[PDB]
Amino acid sequence: NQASVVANQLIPINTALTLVMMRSEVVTPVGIPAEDIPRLVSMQVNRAVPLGTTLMPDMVKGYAA
């Protein structure tokens, strides 16, 4: 099964991501894969990202395909 990224804690908007906030877990819809965890570090999202949220590439400003 394809795995994706998911929030681990209450991540506030306009904040930098970390290893704790990011994790591996299969969720739907499958957005960003688990093979980009060390690449999406210190990334600032353009919206509030609470616990249990499939980290997408469009939401992450700067993270492109």
UniProtKB/Swiss-Prot annotation:
UniProt keyword annotation of Secreted present: yes
Coiled-coil spans in chain: none
AFP-like domain location, by residue?
Answer: 4-63
Q: Is Secreted there in the keyword field?
A: yes
PROSITE patterns given in the database record:
AFP_LIKE
Q: What does this protein do?
A: Contributes to protect fish blood from freezing at subzero sea water temperatures. Lowers the blood freezing point. Binds to nascent ice crystals and prevents further growth.
In Swiss-Prot or TrEMBL terms, this protein is called Type-3 ice-structuring protein HPLC 12
Native source organism of the sequence = Zoarces americanus (Ocean pout)
Upper classification of the source organism reads: Eukaryota, Metazoa, Chordata, Craniata, Vertebrata
